[model samples]
Target: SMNPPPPETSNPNKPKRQTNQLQYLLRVVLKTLWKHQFAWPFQQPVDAVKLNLPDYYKIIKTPMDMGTIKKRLENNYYWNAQECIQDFNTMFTNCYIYNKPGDDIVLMAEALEKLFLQKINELPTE
Candidate 1:
């Protein structure tokens, strides 16, 4: 429900042209805000990969290329592939595993992290 500011009220009896213009402006403003507010966070560094992992593998490409670490980074990673793999594994475990069976924070964090990964991965492959 992250709606933007309410659009300006259009007079019911106003001329069609004025009403149409106002509606157009409102649409533009809402779309602009929606893209920036919703999409901006997905463009951040961690999100660049974190968001794409699931869909790239599960939806678009099955058995995601182990080489994706290289393809996506395209020589940008300063770290070795083995190192990156280990780090990814460890982080996944840390974020998803809960030591206490009934602990809420750990469980919630894990679920949220997984959901986030799923949503990003499933996003349209633009």
Candidate 2:
């Protein structure tokens, strides 16, 4: 028996929405870090010139601040949820690299990093 099946009608132009939800969830976490008490320093990229830290740039190569991460998320630069976390972790790693354990900002970074993971865990299981 020979039968010809007609082509199914589907919208192929629509963008993928599943990842959109992930982006929204991560953005919410970012908001928490943005408003955190110790979030000020992590909000923007560290300015070596302004702070007079001559060796800051020489040490920290990849600077991943909250502002840049947020913008990257908004622009859909991050492809997956893990990538977002990786970016934030990199930012935290940079902080640890530049600021010693006893440094004030290093403590702040620790607090912010902890808060970030907490919020991420608190995301609804959709």
Candidate 3:
């Protein structure tokens, strides 16, 4: 028993079933993000006309939303979790740019941002 078990739990030669396993976990995390009230504000693009801020697009050049994230997730747009979180960061920052302070939308964005960070950080990655 000196050699102990064959270290089955630490096998590196096991045949892998998933090469892009990161995306699957990322999708689960994103689904968690999609299921909350705070995520509602970011679920879709901001209306420029109805909100009477036609210049909304002018300030936020690289706009992102939860809906877009979902689309990208399904379409294999995210190579890693870093890309996934970057989109969320962009979405949140766009809120800060438009709202700039503690506005209603900005509050939602920050709240959702905290949740997003918490969710993504839960992953045990290298």
Winner by lDDT: 2
lDDT of 3 by residue, 1-126 (tens): 011121122224443232244564456677877888888767876767666776777776787787777766665554466666777788888889878687888888777888877877677654
Q: Name the lDDT of candidate 3.
A: 0.67
- Show where candidate 3 strays beyond 4 Å: 1-21, 24-26
For residue 48, what is the lDDT in candidate 3? 71
Query: What is the lDDT of every predicted structure here?
Result: 0.32, 0.72, 0.67
Give the candidates in order of lDDT, highest first.
2, 3, 1
lDDT of 2 by residue, 1-126 (tens): 121231112335533234754655556888778888899987777766677777877787676788777766665555467767888899999999888788998889889888888877866654
Residue range 1-126, candidate 1, lDDT tens digits: 121222122334533232332332224422332243233322221221544433322222112112332222333332233333343244334433323455653454455345434433433321
TM-score of each: 0.25, 0.78, 0.75
| Cα-based RMSD of candidate 3 | 15.6
C-alpha lDDT (0 to 100) for residue 124 of candidate 3:
61
Winner by lDDT between candidate 2 and candidate 1: 2
Evaluated against the true structure, the overall lDDT of model 2 is 0.72
